[PDB]
Amino acid sequence: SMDFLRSLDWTQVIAGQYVSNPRFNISDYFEIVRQPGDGNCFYHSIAELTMPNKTDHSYHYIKRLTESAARKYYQEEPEARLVGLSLEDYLKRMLSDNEWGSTLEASMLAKEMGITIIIWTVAASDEVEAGIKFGDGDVFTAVNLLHSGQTHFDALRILPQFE
Amino acid sequence: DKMQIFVKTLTGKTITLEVEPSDTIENVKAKIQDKEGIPPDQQRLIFAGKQLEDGRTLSDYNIRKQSNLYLLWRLGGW
Ligand code: NA
Ligand SMILES: [Zn+2]
């Protein structure tokens, strides 16, 4: 069980987006770094994993990177089709406080920041239902997020004994 | 003209849908909502690397009987 994370099998579903359905409990392999449930926790979670000396206000930087990413990528992002807003109208809502981030922003930030983002999703349990991965890196180099409930995100860090 | 297609969901379940070639993508999303409860505006239906668009039919995408599709959905967002 100690090498489990080396065994993950990712299937590409659309360009640069991969899915896996491994059977494991999140807390067996990851430290869960809880984020405030203030509507900004997608961006709080990315900040925890990418910004040194992260505070409750680090997320503003990530949202500015999301704006930069969207100006490059929004028009061509397949998930942006579900939003249905022009770029400028999307940006005005995205940048508003307490507006929820999503898999769309994960896709764009992965490209903008040059990183791989994995969102692991659970449903009222420690048990993983799925992982969705934006970018071609592996779990050991990725930014790992935990999606729980409808819109809540926390940050994950691989536990040291699995490195 | 009834046929079936297979849809693998983000969470790894394979479901079987009863469809017709003239069914639109929106029609298929409605069938998926009936079976899995996912709102159509949250659904990302994918075939052979392409996210399918509302307003098109299964025929337009060369989706024949026993085709295998993927269903992703948004995580988070408004
Ligand atoms: Na996306
Ligand atoms: Zn602030």
Numbering used by the authors:
A (entry chain A): 0 to 162
B (entry chain B): -1 to 76
What do the study authors state?
Here we applied protein engineering technology to target virus-encoded deubiquitinating enzymes of two viruses with significant impact on human health: Middle East respiratory syndrome coronavirus (MERS-CoV) and Crimean-Congo hemorrhagic fever virus (CCHFV). This resulted in the rapid identification of ubiquitin variant (UbV) inhibitors that bound with high affinity and specificity to the viral deubiquitinating enzymes. Strikingly, coronaviral PLpros also act as vDUBs to suppress host antiviral innate immune responses by targeting cellular Ub-conjugated substrates. The CCHFV vDUB domain is located within the large (L) segment of the genome, and has also been explicitly implicated in the evasion of host Ub- and ISG15-dependent innate immune responses.
Conversely, structural studies of nairovirus vDUBs revealed resemblance to the ovarian tumor (OTU) domain family of DUBs. Similarly, crystal structures of CCHFV OTU were determined bound to CC.2 or CC.4 to gain insight into how they selectively block the DUB and deISGylating activities of the viral protease. CC.2 and CC.4 were bound in the same orientation as Ub.wt with similar buried surface areas of ~1000 Å2. Interestingly, substitutions in these UbVs were concentrated in the C-terminal region and only substitutions at position 68 and downstream were found to interact with the enzyme. In both UbVs, Tyr68 improves hydrophobic packing with Thr10*, Val12* and Val18* (asterisks denote amino acid numbering of the large segment-encoded protein of CCHFV), relative to His68 in Ub.wt. In CC.2, residue Leu70 projects further into a hydrophobic cavity in CCHFV OTU formed by residues Val12*, Ile14*, Val18* and Ile131*, than does the equivalent Ub.wt residue Val70. The conformational freedom of a Gly substitution at position 74 enables the C-terminal tail of each UbV to form numerous favorable interactions with the enzyme. Residues Gly75 and Val75 of CC.2 and CC.4, respectively, occupy space on the CCHFV OTU surface, which in the case of Ub.wt is occupied by the side-chain of Arg74. This alternative conformation permitted by Gly74 in CC.2 and CC.4 allows the side-chain of Trp76 or Trp77 of CC.2 or CC.4, respectively, to pack within different adjacent grooves near the CCHFV OTU active site, with Trp76 of CC.2 forming a cation-π interaction with Arg92*, and the amide nitrogen group of CC.4 residue Trp77 forming a hydrogen bond with the side chain of Gln149*. Conversely, Trp71 in both CC.2 and CC.4 does not interact with CCHFV OTU, but instead packs into a hydrophobic cavity within each UbV.
